[PDB]
Amino acid sequence: GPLGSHMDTQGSPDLGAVELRIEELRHHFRVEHAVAEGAKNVLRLLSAAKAPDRKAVSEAQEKLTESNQKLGLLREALERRLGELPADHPKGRLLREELAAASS
Structure with missing residues (x-):
C-alpha cells in the first residue's frame, strides 16, 4: 500500500470527536x-x-x-475526558467545576 506522507501531528486527541462524547457523558x-x-x-x-x-x-x-x-462511573469517565482537554477550552473548564461540585 502507498504511504509515507504527513497527516500533520496535532496536540491532544481530536476535539471534534471527543467533545461529542463529552455532550452525552455530561448529559448522563x-x-x-x-x-x-x-x-x-x-x-x-x-x-x-x-x-x-x-x-x-x-x-x-x-x-x-x-x-x-x-x-x-460517569464522573471517572469525565475525569479522564477533561484531563485530555485544554483548560482554555470552555467544556474543560466547566466539566472540572461540575466534577468539583460533585466530588472529584
Missing part, C-alpha cells in the same frame, strides 16, 4: 446527578416526618442508589 452526569440530589431531598423530607411512608422511602432509596453509584 447531569440527569443522574439531578435525581441523585433530588432523592436525598426526598429522604430528608420524609425522614423529617414523624410518620414517613414505607413505600415512598423504598421509591427514593432505589432511584438514589442507581444515580449515586452511576455518578461514580
